[PDB]
């Protein structure tokens, strides 16, 4: 399953460097776009993001495992697009930053797995029609 593995590698790498603050083919191009658009979405939606973060009340590892419920519940609500997919990964980065401050850095890798799982399981067909990560790069090109 190339699509699950590829998506996990991109989401995990970006979530790691958003918490650490230290950066590290098709995947190479996708991370460049994700840094540019992701950090953009985080600024434009800080009021909504901090409001959701305080409502969730993430203090330990148990809370991180229960996030998959809310994830599926709100991500599946309406119609999907590249922007909503970017908001999913951007808020995922906004939570990973909170996990660094509360000394729960060990919960960054499983959160990235849970995010990839929801994305691929609910939207595989949409992602395939849209040309996967090649499509993601071409969509946000400026």
């Amino acid at each position, epitope marked *: 399953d190339d699509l699950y593995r590829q998506s996990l590698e991109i989401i995990s790498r970006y979530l790691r460097e958003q918490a650490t603050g230290s950066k590290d083919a098709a995947g190479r*191009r996708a991370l460049e776009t994700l840094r540019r658009v992701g950090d953009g979405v985080q600024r434009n939606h800080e009021t909504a993001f901090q409001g959701m973060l305080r409502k969730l009340d993430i203090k330990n590892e148990d809370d991180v495992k229960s996030l998959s419920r809310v994830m599926i519940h709100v991500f599946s609500d309406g119609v999907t697009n590249w922007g909503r997919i970017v908001t999913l990964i951007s808020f995922g980065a906004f939570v990973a930053k909170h996990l660094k401050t509360i000394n729960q850095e060990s919960c960054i890798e499983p959160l990235a797995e849970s995010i990839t799982d929801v994305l691929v399981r609910t939207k595989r067909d949409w992602l395939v*029609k849209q*040309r996967g*990560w*090649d*499509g993601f*790069v*071409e969509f946000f*090109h400026v």
Partner: single-chain antibody, 229 residues
Framework: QVTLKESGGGLVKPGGSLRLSCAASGFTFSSYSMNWVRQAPGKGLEWVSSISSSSSYIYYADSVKGRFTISRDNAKNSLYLQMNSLRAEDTAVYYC????????????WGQGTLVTVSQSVLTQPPSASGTPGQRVTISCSGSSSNIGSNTVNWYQQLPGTAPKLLIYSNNQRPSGVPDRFSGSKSGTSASLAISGLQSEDEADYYCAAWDDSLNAWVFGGGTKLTVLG
């Protein structure tokens, strides 16, 4: 100066082989999907193949599967068409075209190259006519898997010229297209409107959309528009 320029066309015997090249200038080539589109002499547009930016997503029309091979070299800004087992039916002018990531419209087209070897899924009326100032409408009929699931694009083709993007995303006009031109979509049909005819409007008009069942681009058969009196 954002341009595309085709090379390789020539006379070939049936069953022969020929290789096409397309050189891109003025843009980040590594960040765009690329297409081949052919036009038999005195006939309509026909999509051939497409390749994504990283070469991961490749598609072909049924009439070329197994004989034609699309490839790209981002380090040389080049797109290729490797054509084996060439048939009389393959005689056409082959166009190189750039596709927009956010819309799938073909915004930049090359001048074409003649390859000489020696029924469309979207229906349009074969002709339309009017007088200066008149409002004329051109229709485009498809089905659930194409127009019913995807956006419609329109292309203008002036006599002895390459096609150009007229309308994208059903009703959006690119920069340089007069507001006389407008579009609409309803169910599995679409329409092109010219509110106030001008003599430079005399041309051929084609619609196009992606098909989810065929995994292919389907073009309309075209409409020859004449400006009278």
């Amino acid at each position: 100066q954002v341009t595309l320029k085709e090379s390789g066309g020539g006379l070939v015997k049936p069953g022969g082989s020929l290789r096409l090249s397309c050189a891109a200038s003025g843009f980040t080539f590594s960040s765009y999907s690329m297409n081949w589109v052919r036009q038999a002499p005195g006939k309509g547009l026909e999509w051939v193949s497409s390749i994504s930016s990283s070469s991961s997503y490749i598609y072909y029309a049924d009439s070329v599967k197994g004989r034609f091979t699309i490839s790209r070299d981002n380090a040389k800004n080049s797109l290729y068409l490797q054509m084996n087992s060439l048939r009389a039916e393959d005689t056409a002018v082959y166009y190189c075209a750039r596709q927009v990531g956010a819309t799938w419209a073909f915004d930049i087209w090359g001048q074409g190259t003649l390859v000489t070897v020696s029924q469309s899924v979207l229906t349009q009326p074969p002709s339309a006519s009017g007088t200066p100032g008149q409002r004329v409408t051109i229709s485009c009929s498809g089905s659930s898997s194409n127009i019913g699931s995807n956006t419609v694009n329109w292309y203008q083709q002036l006599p002895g010229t390459a096609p150009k993007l007229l309308i994208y995303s059903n009703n959006q006009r690119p920069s340089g297209v007069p507001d006389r031109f407008s579009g609409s979509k309803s169910g599995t049909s679409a329409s092109l409107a010219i509110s106030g005819l001008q003599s430079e409007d005399e041309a051929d008009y084609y619609c196009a959309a992606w098909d989810d069942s065929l995994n292919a681009w389907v073009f309309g058969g075209g409409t020859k528009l004449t400006v009278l009196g």
